[PDB]
Write a protein that holds these residues in place. Structure first.
Motif, PDB file in Angstrom:
ATOM      1  N   UNK A   1       0.834  -1.155   0.191  1.00  0.00           N
ATOM      2  CA  UNK A   1      -0.087   0.184  -0.158  1.00  0.00           C
ATOM      3  C   UNK A   1       0.883   1.478   0.183  1.00  0.00           C
ATOM      4  N   UNK A   2       0.713   2.195  -0.701  1.00  0.00           N
ATOM      5  CA  UNK A   2       0.985   3.422  -0.822  1.00  0.00           C
ATOM      6  C   UNK A   2      -0.171   4.583  -0.696  1.00  0.00           C
ATOM      7  N   UNK A   3       0.365   5.506   0.409  1.00  0.00           N
ATOM      8  CA  UNK A   3      -0.746   6.518   0.645  1.00  0.00           C
ATOM      9  C   UNK A   3      -0.303   7.841   0.247  1.00  0.00           C
ATOM     10  N   UNK A   4      -1.260   8.798  -0.022  1.00  0.00           N
ATOM     11  CA  UNK A   4      -1.210  10.196  -0.555  1.00  0.00           C
ATOM     12  C   UNK A   4      -2.203  10.975   0.022  1.00  0.00           C
ATOM     13  N   UNK A   5      -1.848  11.948   0.573  1.00  0.00           N
ATOM     14  CA  UNK A   5      -3.046  13.119   1.191  1.00  0.00           C
ATOM     15  C   UNK A   5      -2.475  14.549   1.015  1.00  0.00           C
ATOM     16  N   UNK A   6      -3.385  15.506   0.873  1.00  0.00           N
ATOM     17  CA  UNK A   6      -3.317  16.730   0.802  1.00  0.00           C
ATOM     18  C   UNK A   6      -2.443  17.512   1.902  1.00  0.00           C
ATOM     19  N   UNK A   7      -1.619  18.212   1.714  1.00  0.00           N
ATOM     20  CA  UNK A   7      -0.788  19.077   2.328  1.00  0.00           C
ATOM     21  C   UNK A   7      -1.750  20.109   2.808  1.00  0.00           C
ATOM     22  N   UNK A   8      -2.075  20.281   4.410  1.00  0.00           N
ATOM     23  CA  UNK A   8      -2.764  21.219   4.722  1.00  0.00           C
ATOM     24  C   UNK A   8      -4.144  21.514   4.093  1.00  0.00           C
ATOM     25  N   UNK A   9      -4.930  20.368   4.010  1.00  0.00           N
ATOM     26  CA  UNK A   9      -6.136  20.352   3.055  1.00  0.00           C
ATOM     27  C   UNK A   9      -7.044  21.512   3.264  1.00  0.00           C
ATOM     28  N   UNK A  10      -7.824  21.706   4.220  1.00  0.00           N
ATOM     29  CA  UNK A  10      -8.778  22.609   4.471  1.00  0.00           C
ATOM     30  C   UNK A  10      -8.275  24.075   4.128  1.00  0.00           C
ATOM     31  N   UNK A  11      -7.252  24.399   4.845  1.00  0.00           N
ATOM     32  CA  UNK A  11      -6.662  25.669   4.582  1.00  0.00           C
ATOM     33  C   UNK A  11      -5.990  25.956   3.087  1.00  0.00           C
ATOM     34  N   UNK A  12      -5.694  24.952   2.373  1.00  0.00           N
ATOM     35  CA  UNK A  12      -5.140  25.120   1.151  1.00  0.00           C
ATOM     36  C   UNK A  12      -6.464  25.192   0.033  1.00  0.00           C
ATOM     37  N   UNK A  13      -7.580  24.543   0.288  1.00  0.00           N
ATOM     38  CA  UNK A  13      -8.686  24.652  -0.275  1.00  0.00           C
ATOM     39  C   UNK A  13      -9.238  26.206  -0.188  1.00  0.00           C
ATOM     40  N   UNK A  14      -9.337  26.922   1.259  1.00  0.00           N
ATOM     41  CA  UNK A  14      -9.397  28.395   1.357  1.00  0.00           C
ATOM     42  C   UNK A  14      -8.737  29.265   0.606  1.00  0.00           C
ATOM     43  N   UNK A  15      -7.371  28.949   0.543  1.00  0.00           N
ATOM     44  CA  UNK A  15      -6.608  29.672  -0.338  1.00  0.00           C
ATOM     45  C   UNK A  15      -6.792  29.552  -1.633  1.00  0.00           C
ATOM     46  N   UNK A  16      -6.725  28.128  -2.239  1.00  0.00           N
ATOM     47  CA  UNK A  16      -7.010  27.947  -3.778  1.00  0.00           C
ATOM     48  C   UNK A  16      -8.405  28.637  -4.305  1.00  0.00           C
ATOM     49  N   UNK A  17      -9.477  28.484  -3.527  1.00  0.00           N
ATOM     50  CA  UNK A  17     -10.603  28.881  -4.043  1.00  0.00           C
ATOM     51  C   UNK A  17     -11.035  30.320  -3.716  1.00  0.00           C
ATOM     52  N   UNK A  18     -10.112  30.812  -2.857  1.00  0.00           N
ATOM     53  CA  UNK A  18     -10.252  32.248  -2.236  1.00  0.00           C
ATOM     54  C   UNK A  18     -11.416  32.533  -1.463  1.00  0.00           C
ATOM     55  N   UNK A  19     -11.735  31.717  -0.373  1.00  0.00           N
ATOM     56  CA  UNK A  19     -12.728  31.595   0.676  1.00  0.00           C
ATOM     57  C   UNK A  19     -12.784  32.698   1.449  1.00  0.00           C
ATOM     58  N   UNK A  20     -13.902  33.744   1.584  1.00  0.00           N
ATOM     59  CA  UNK A  20     -13.743  34.621   2.557  1.00  0.00           C
ATOM     60  C   UNK A  20     -14.834  35.698   2.687  1.00  0.00           C
ATOM     61  N   UNK A  21     -15.096  36.122   3.716  1.00  0.00           N
ATOM     62  CA  UNK A  21     -16.584  36.818   3.898  1.00  0.00           C
ATOM     63  C   UNK A  21     -16.657  37.750   2.634  1.00  0.00           C
ATOM     64  N   UNK A  22     -15.526  38.592   2.410  1.00  0.00           N
ATOM     65  CA  UNK A  22     -15.709  39.769   1.460  1.00  0.00           C
ATOM     66  C   UNK A  22     -15.425  39.216   0.044  1.00  0.00           C
ATOM     67  N   UNK A  23     -14.950  37.899  -0.176  1.00  0.00           N
ATOM     68  CA  UNK A  23     -14.777  37.577  -1.743  1.00  0.00           C
ATOM     69  C   UNK A  23     -15.761  36.829  -2.186  1.00  0.00           C
ATOM     70  N   UNK A  24     -17.006  37.014  -1.702  1.00  0.00           N
ATOM     71  CA  UNK A  24     -18.161  36.180  -2.454  1.00  0.00           C
ATOM     72  C   UNK A  24     -18.711  36.893  -3.644  1.00  0.00           C
ATOM     73  N   UNK A  25     -18.613  36.449  -4.640  1.00  0.00           N
ATOM     74  CA  UNK A  25     -18.989  37.098  -5.747  1.00  0.00           C
ATOM     75  C   UNK A  25     -20.403  36.740  -6.351  1.00  0.00           C
ATOM     76  N   UNK A  26     -20.938  35.618  -5.989  1.00  0.00           N
ATOM     77  CA  UNK A  26     -22.339  35.069  -6.218  1.00  0.00           C
ATOM     78  C   UNK A  26     -22.439  33.396  -6.032  1.00  0.00           C
ATOM     79  N   UNK A  27     -23.560  33.045  -6.867  1.00  0.00           N
ATOM     80  CA  UNK A  27     -23.793  31.557  -6.966  1.00  0.00           C
ATOM     81  C   UNK A  27     -23.874  31.151  -8.304  1.00  0.00           C
ATOM     82  N   UNK A  28     -23.676  29.896  -8.736  1.00  0.00           N
ATOM     83  CA  UNK A  28     -23.886  29.261  -9.888  1.00  0.00           C
ATOM     84  C   UNK A  28     -25.127  28.289  -9.624  1.00  0.00           C
TER      85      UNK A  28
END
Ligand SMILES: Cc1cn([C@H]2C[C@H](O)[C@@H](COP(=O)(O)OP(=O)(O)OP(=O)(O)O)O2)c(=O)[nH]c1=O
Ligand SMILES: [Ca+2]
Ligand SMILES: [Ca+2]
Ligand SMILES: [Ca+2]
Ligand SMILES: [Ca+2]
Ligand SMILES: [Ca+2]
Length: 901
Positions: free
Chosen positions: A407-434
Motif C-alpha cells: 500500500x502507498x498512501x497520499x494526502x493533501x498538504x494542509x487540506x482545508x486551509x489549502x482549499x480556502x487559499x485555492x478557492x479564495x474563500x472569505x467573507x468579502x470575496x463572495x461574488x455570487x452563486x451558480x
DNA sequence: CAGGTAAGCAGTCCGCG
DNA sequence: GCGGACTGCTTAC
C-alpha cells in the motif's frame, strides 16, 4: 528593546495594562482609553474607513468605553449595524502595539504552583474552603526558585520542619529523592500558623506577581481554594490581593450537564497546565492525574506513600512536603518537553490577545483578522445571532474489508486551509452563486463549467479572483509558520533514525554526545562521527533528537490546528465571520477533490498496467487516498529485490517520479475546471507499507471506514530503522481499551502484518492461557462518566442506564456512608470491570475513579469476583475476531487431514 | 468552556411469528 | 441472537 504587553484588562472606563517597557522593566498603567466604533455613512461623505464590502463608514469616537457599549445597545434598538471591535481591550492592544510583537520570555513571570490541604471528611471543596492550607510550593521562572510555604501547626496536627537533607537522599536511604538539580533552588519557609503563612504568601505574591499562572488543576482547585480560604479568614478585600488590580469575579463555567465556578483574577493570565495538555498534546488519556501524565510523558515512577492522602501530613510530613515540591517540578519537566507555555506565548502575541485566549480559536482569529483589516483602514462587521444548523463535511470511501499486501498512501498538504487559499474563500470575496449539478457530475467532469469569471466551489459558491481575501491572506501566514516547524520536526525524526541504525554497532569507548542542531539533517561529517560513538553517547543523542522532534511537533501540529480551526470557525455561530456558504464551500470542494483524484489515479494506473475498470484506490478519507501497489511490485517480480529496503526504494521512486506528477496534472485540471485562483492541491506520498521481504506477513488490512492497520517502512520521507505500525481506529488506539489488551491486540496485529497466520495463532493461544495473571488495572476498561445522577434511582440503575454508569452505582453502594473512600467525579474517567454472577456487589460490573487503585475496603472482593471470561471475550476476542475475519485468516488453527498423524 | 463533520463500536430495549 | 432505534463514548480527519 521594543515594548510588549504582559496582561490587559478592562475595568469600567479604564484599561489596566501590565507591560515590559523599552528598558526591559515590568510596569503597570491605567489608561482612560477612548474607543472608536463605526456606522455606515453616505457616499457623499468623504472618509478613509470602509467596511469589508467597500461601503464607506464614519468613525465614532467615544468619551469612554461605557459610552461605546451603550451606543451599541441603542444601535440594536434602532436596528442598525454597529461596526468595529466591540472588545475594547483588543482595540487597545491594536493601537498600542501597532507592529509585529517581539517578546522576551525571560522578562515574563511564569508562576507554577501547587497547594496541599488535609481533609478528614472527603474532597476539600474549593467553594467552601473549610480546611487549612497546609503547604504551598510556588516556583517563579524569573528567580528560578521553588518557594515552599510549610504549615507546621494545624488543627489536624503539629509537625516538625521538613528537612532538605532527607529530601535529597535516595528512597533506599529513607529519603524522598527530590531531584538534585533542584535542591539548591528550594527556598523553604516554615510557619507556626496559617494566618501568617497566607499573609506572607500574599506579600510574596505582591513582590512576584505572576503574569502567566499555571500548575495542575490550578484553575479548578488551587486558585479558587486559595482565594476562598483567604476570603474566609481575612475577608474579600484581602483575597482580592491575588489580582494586581484588586479585581476578581466568580465565573460560572456551564456545560451540557451542569456548571462549575472559577475565579477570574484580573491582570493575571491563568493557563492551567491540564487544559494546555488537553488542547495541545493530541493524546486522549485514561486518566489526567499528574502521576499518570508524568509517568506517560517522562517515564518517572509514581509518587509512593502508605495510607490515605488525608493522613500523609501527620504520618509523614517529610514526604508530604517533598511530594508537593516534586509535583510542581513535574509540571515544569512536562513543559520543558512539550513547550506548551512557549506555544501559548507565541500564538497570543501573534494574534494580539490576552494570552489565555489561545484556548479559543474563534477569539484568536477574530483578533488576527481585526488587526489585518485595521492595517488597511477597513472596518470589521458587527457579530450577529445565528441559529445552529448542520452542514456537510468530508467524504469517506467504503473500503472492501480485506488484507492489503502493498500500500502507498497520499494526502493533501494542509487540506482545508489549502482549499480556502485555492478557492479564495472569505467573507468579502463572495461574488455570487451558480446553478449546481450533482457532485458526481463534477467528479466525472461532465457538469458544465461553473464560471468563466469567478473561482468556484461545487456547492455553488463563486469568489472574486482579483485579490486575496483576508481569510486566505491570514491563513497563509500561519500555514507558512507551520511548514517551517514541520521541517524541523521531520529532520529531527530522520536524524533519530540515523542514531538508531548506529546503535546496532556501538563502539567500546568513553566519549561525548556531539553538539549538533537536531532540527537540520546531519551532515556527512556528523554521520561519520556517530558511527564511531559509544552506546551511552548515542542514547543521549537519541534522547536529544527525540526532544527536538517533540518540540517541532508541538510548534507545527498546533499551528495546523489553528488554521484548521478557521475552516470550522466559519461554521460556528459565535464567529464574527460565520457563514454556512463558506463553511460548506470548503467541505464540498474537499469531497470533490478526493473523488476527483481517486478517478485520476485509477485511470493513470489502469493505463500503466494495461487494464480497465480496476480499482487501485482501495480507500480514502477526507483528503487521502490509499493505493494498492501489489501490481506494481508484481510487474517487476518479488524475486528481483535484494531486501525489503530495495522494494521500498522502488515504490518511493515510483510514487515520487510517476504518481505525484500524475496526481499534480489531475489537480491542475480540476483547478482549471473550477477556475480557482491558485493551484494549491499538493497530494504527497504519506506511507509506503508492505510485509517484510520473504515473510508470510499480510502487510495490512481494513475492517471498515476509519479502521485499518499498515506495516509502514517509510513515512513522509522518514525511512525507519525498524518497521512501524500505522494503526487507525482499531481498539489498540482507543483509551477505552484496557492497557494490557491494547498491548496484546497490537502484538496480534504486528504478527499478522509482519509474520503471518501461524505466528498470530501461537501468540493468541499463549495470551488466552496467561491473561488471568494480568494486574486488574491493566485489564479494566475505561470510560468518561456523564449523567451519573440522571440514571441513579435510589442508588440503583434507572431505565437505559449505561454499563459504565451501572458500575459506578455499584461502587457507590459498596462504599456507602464513607467520607474517606474516593468518590467518582461527575464528568471524569472510571475504570470498569465485569463481575461474575452471584457476587456480593449485587450487579454485573463495578467502576471506580481511573488512574487509581480501588479502595482497600472492596479491592479483595473485586479481585475475587472479576469476570475474566467476559473481560477477555469483550475486549480481546471480539475485536481480534473482527481483525482476522477482515484479513481472512484464523487466530485459532482449524483441523486438517494431517491431524490423523 | 475553548473550530467543524463523519463514523465506528458497546450497550439498552425490544421486535422478530 | 441480531438488527434497528437510540444513548453514550471515542476516534479519524
Ligand atoms: C486532524 C484534523 C483534520 N481536520 C480536517 C481539516 C484538515 O485539513 C483535513 C485533513 O486532515 P489531515 O490530513 O490530518 O491534516 P492537514 O491536511 O490539515 O495537514 P497535513 O499537511 O499534516 O496533512 O481534515 C480537522 O478538521 N480537525 C483535525 O483535528
Ligand atoms: Ca497533592
Ligand atoms: Ca492532509
Ligand atoms: Ca504530507
Ligand atoms: Ca559504531
Ligand atoms: Ca489525511
Amino acid at each position: 528593546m521594543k515594548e510588549f504587553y504582559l496582561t490587559v484588562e478592562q475595568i469600567g472606563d479604564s484599561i489596566f495594562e501590565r507591560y515590559i517597557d523599552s528598558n526591559g522593566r515590568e510596569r503597570t498603567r491605567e489608561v482612560e482609553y477612548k474607543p472608536s466604533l463605526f456606522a455606515h455613512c453616505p457616499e457623499s461623505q468623504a472618509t478613509k474607513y470602509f467596511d469589508i464590502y467597500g461601503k464607506p463608514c464614519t468613525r465614532k469616537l467615544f468619551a469612554n468605553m461605557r459610552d461605546a457599549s451603550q451606543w451599541i445597545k441603542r444601535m440594536e434598538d434602532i436596528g442598525l449595524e454597529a461596526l468595529g471591535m466591540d472588545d475594547f481591550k483588543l482595540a487597545y492592544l491594536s493601537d498600542t502595539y501597532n507592529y509585529e510583537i517581539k517578546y522576551d520570555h525571560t522578562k515574563i513571570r511564569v508562576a507554577n504552583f501547587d497547594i496541599e490541604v488535609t481533609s478528614p471528611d472527603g474532597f476539600p471543596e474549593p467553594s467552601q474552603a473549610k480546611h487549612p492550607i497546609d503547604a504551598i510550593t510556588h516556583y517563579d521562572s524569573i528567580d528560578d526558585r521553588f518557594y515552599v510555604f510549610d504549615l507546621l501547626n494545624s488543627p489536624y496536627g503539629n509537625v516538625e520542619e521538613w528537612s532538605i537533607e532527607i529530601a535529597a537522599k535516595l528512597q533506599e536511604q529513607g529519603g524522598d529523592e527530590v531531584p538534585s538539580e533542584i535542591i539548591d533552588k528550594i527556598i523553604y519557609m516554615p510557619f507556626d500558623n496559617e494566618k501568617e503563612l497566607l499573609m506572607e504568601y500574599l506579600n510574596f505574591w505582591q513582590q512576584k506577581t505572576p503574569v502567566i499562572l499555571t500548575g495542575w488543576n490550578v484553575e479548578s482547585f488551587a486558585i479558587p481554594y486559595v482565594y476562598n480560604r483567604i476570603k474566609n479568614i481575612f475577608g474579600e478585600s484581602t483575597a482580592k490581593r491575588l489580582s494586581p488590580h484588586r479585581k476578581t469575579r466568580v465565573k460560572v463555567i456551564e456545560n451540557m450537564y451542569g456548571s462549575r465556578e472559577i475565579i477570574t483574577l484580573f491582570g493575571i493570565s491563568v493557563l492551567d497546565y491540564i487544559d494546555l495538555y488537553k488542547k495541545f498534546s493530541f493524546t486522549n488519556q485514561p486518566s489526567y492525574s499528574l502521576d499518570y501524565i508524568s509517568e506517560f510523558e517522562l517515564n518517572v515512577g509514581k509518587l509512593k506513600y502508605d495510607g490515605p492522602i488525608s493522613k500523609l501530613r501527620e504520618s509523614n510530613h517529610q514526604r508530604y512536603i517533598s511530594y508537593n515540591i516534586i509535583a510542581v517540578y513535574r509540571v515544569l519537566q512536562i513543559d520543558a518537553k512539550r513547550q506548551f507555555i512557549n506555544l501559548s506565548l507565541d500564538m497570543g502575541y501573534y494574534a494580539k490577545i490576552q494570552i489565555q485566549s489561545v484556548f479559543s480559536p474563534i477569539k484568536t482569529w477574530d483578533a488576527i483578522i481585526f488587526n489585518s483589516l485595521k492595517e488597511q483602514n477597513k472596518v470589521i462587521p458587527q457579530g450577529r445571532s445565528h441559529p445552529v444548523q448542520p452542514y456537510p463535511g468530508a467524504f469517506v470511501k467504503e473500503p472492501i474489508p480485506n488484507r492489503y499486501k502493498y500500500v502507498m498512501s497520499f494526502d493533501l498538504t494542509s487540506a482545508y486551509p489549502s482549499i480556502i487559499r485555492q478557492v479564495n474563500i472569505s467573507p468579502e470575496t463572495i461574488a455570487g452563486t451558480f446553478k449546481v449539478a450533482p457532485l458526481h457530475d463534477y467528479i466525472n467532469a461532465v457538469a458544465e463549467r461553473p464560471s468563466d469569471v469567478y473561482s468556484c466551489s461545487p456547492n455553488g459558491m463563486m469568489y472574486y479572483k482579483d485579490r486575496d481575501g483576508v481569510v486566505p491572506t491570514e491563513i497563509t501566514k500561519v500555514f507558512n509558520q507551520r511548514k517551517e516547524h514541520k521541517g524541523y520536526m521531520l529532520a529531527a525524526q530522520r536524524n533519530g533514525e540515523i542514531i538508531k541504525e548506529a546503535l546496532h554497532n556501538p563502539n567500546l569507548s568513553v566519549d561525548e554526545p556531539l553538539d549538533v542542531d537536531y532540527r537540520f539533517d546531519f551532515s556527512d561529517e556528523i554521520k561519520e562521527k556517530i558511527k564511531k560513538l559509544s552506546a551511552k553517547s548515542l542514547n543521549e543523542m537519541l534522547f536529544r533528537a527525540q526532544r527536538t522532534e517533540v518540540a517541532g511537533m508541538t510548534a507545527q501540529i498546533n499551528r495546523k490546528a489553528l488554521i484548521n480551526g478557521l475552516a470550522g470557525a466559519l461554521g460556528n455561530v459565535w464567529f464574527r465571520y460565520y457563514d454556512l456558504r463558506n463553511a460548506t464551500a470548503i467541505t464540498t470542494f474537499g469531497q470533490m477533490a478526493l473523488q476527483w483524484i481517486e478517478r485520476k489515479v485509477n485511470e493513470y494506473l489502469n493505463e500503466v498496467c494495461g487494464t480497465e475498470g480496476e480499482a487501485f484506490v482501495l480507500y480514502g478519507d477526507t483528503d487521502s487516498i490509499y493505493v494498492s501497489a501489489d501490481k506494481i511490485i508484481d510487474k517487476v517480480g518479488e524475486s528481483k529485490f535484494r531486501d525489503t529496503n530495495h522494494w521500498v526504494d522502488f515504490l518511493d521512486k515510483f510514487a515520487r517520479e510517476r504518481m505525484e506528477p500524475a496526481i499534480d496534472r489531475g489537480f491542475r485540471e480540476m483547478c482549471e475546471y473550477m477556475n480557482n485562483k491558485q493551484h494549491l492541491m499538493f497530494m504527497d506520498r504519506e506511507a509506503i507499507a508492505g510485509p517484510p521481504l520473504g515473510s508470510k506477513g499480510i502487510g495490512g488490512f481494513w475492517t471498515g471506514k476509519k479502521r485499518y492497520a499498515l506495516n509502514v517502512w517509510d513515512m513522509e520521507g522518514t525511512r525507519y530503522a525498524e518497521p512501524k505500525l500505522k494503526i487507525m481506529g482499531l481498539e489498540t488506539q482507543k483509551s477505552s481499551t484496557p492497557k494490557a489488551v491494547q498491548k496484546a491486540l497490537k502484538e496480534c496485529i504486528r504478527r499478522m502484518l509482519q509474520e503471518g497466520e501461524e505466528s498470530l495463532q501461537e501468540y493468541f493461544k499463549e495470551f488466552e492461557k496467561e491473561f488471568r495473571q494480568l494486574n486488574y488495572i491493566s485489564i479494566a476498561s475505561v470510560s468518561s462518566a456523564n449523567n451519573i445522577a440522571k440514571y441513579d434511582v435510589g442508588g440503583f440503575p434507572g431505565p437505559k442506564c449505561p454499563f459504565h454508569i451501572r458500575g459506578i452505582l455499584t461502587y457507590n453502594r459498596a462504599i456507602k456512608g464513607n467520607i474517606d473512600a474516593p468518590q467518582v467525579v461527575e464528568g471524569e474517567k472510571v475504570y470498569v470491570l465485569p463481575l461474575r454472577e452471584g457476587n456480593p456487589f449485587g450487579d454485573k460490573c463495578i467502576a471506580w475513579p481511573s488512574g487509581t487503585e480501588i479502595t482497600d475496603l472492596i479491592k479483595d472482593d473485586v479481585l475475587h469476583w472479576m469476570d475474566y471470561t467476559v473481560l477477555l471475550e469483550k475486549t480481546f476476542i471480539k475485536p481480534l475476531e473482527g481483525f482476522t475475519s477482515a484479513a481472512k485468516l484464523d487466530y485459532e488453527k482449524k483441523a486438517s487431514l494431517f491431524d490423523m498423524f
